[PDB]
Design an enzyme around this catalytic site. Structure first.
Site, PDB file in Angstrom:
ATOM      1  CB  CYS A   1      -1.027  -0.037   1.169  1.00 21.54           C
ATOM      2  SG  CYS A   1      -0.287  -0.090   2.819  1.00 21.54           S
TER       3      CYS A   1
ATOM      4  NE  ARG B   1      -4.667   1.486   1.401  1.00 22.72           N
ATOM      5  CZ  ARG B   1      -4.338   2.184   0.334  1.00 22.72           C
ATOM      6  NH1 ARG B   1      -5.095   2.100  -0.754  1.00 22.72           N
ATOM      7  NH2 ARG B   1      -3.267   2.975   0.346  1.00 22.72           N
TER       8      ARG B   1
ATOM      9  CG  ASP C   1      -5.025   5.356   2.370  1.00 20.27           C
ATOM     10  OD1 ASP C   1      -5.108   4.730   3.447  1.00 20.27           O
ATOM     11  OD2 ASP C   1      -4.044   6.076   2.041  1.00 20.27           O
TER      12      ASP C   1
END
Lengths: 158, 7
Positions: free
Chosen positions: A13, A19, A125
């Site tokens: 990420c 994440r 996100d």
């Protein structure tokens, strides 16, 4: 006759705080629960600045809620020479930045949601959205399909 | 939290 080496999968990420740590921890536990031993899980962030930091509070809370351990997991930069057998990015910017950082990447690069029936292509996100539950649901939608793909692709024992 | 590395 199976391939008897390990294979490495990295989730990637931007920050390596929300994440990809969540995905790493879920994947590691899932492999344990499925009695699969030859897949080692990692994570990186293309843009991690403060290195060596624990996951975001929102990711720790989701993992704690579901009794998923994340001991020792800390933020790590996607390095100029980083490479893994399988690289699983969260969103398009991650794909783009990975390929710019290491144009010599030899592993197989995918987005997480390529392994999901969800209509979405990219994992938003939650550093911004705060939607850690949504990220969790997205990882769960992909996790067993990703495992199955790697076990078959790498000729591993289950 | 920026996409600086790689751009």
């Amino acid at each position: 006759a199976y391939f008897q080496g390990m294979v490495d999968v990295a989730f990637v990420c931007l920050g390596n705080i929300c994440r990809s740590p969540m995905a790493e921890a879920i994947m590691r536990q899932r492999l344990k629960d499925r009695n699969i031993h030859d897949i080692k899980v990692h994570s990186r962030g293309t843009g991690s600045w403060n290195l060596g930091e624990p996951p975001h509070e929102g990711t720790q809370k989701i993992l704690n809620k579901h009794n998923i351990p994340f001991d020792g997991m800390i933020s790590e930069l996607f390095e100029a020479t980083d490479d893994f057998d399988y690289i699983v990015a969260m969103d398009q910017s991650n794909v783009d930045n990975i390929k710019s950082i290491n144009p010599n990447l030899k592993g197989q690069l995918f987005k997480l949601l390529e392994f999901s029936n969800m209509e979405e292509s990219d994992v938003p996100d939650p550093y911004y959205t705060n939607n850690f539950e949504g990220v969790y649901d997205m990882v769960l939608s992909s996790c067993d399909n990703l495992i199955d793909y790697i076990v078959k692709d790498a000729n591993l024992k289950g | 939290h920026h996409h600086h590395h790689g751009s």
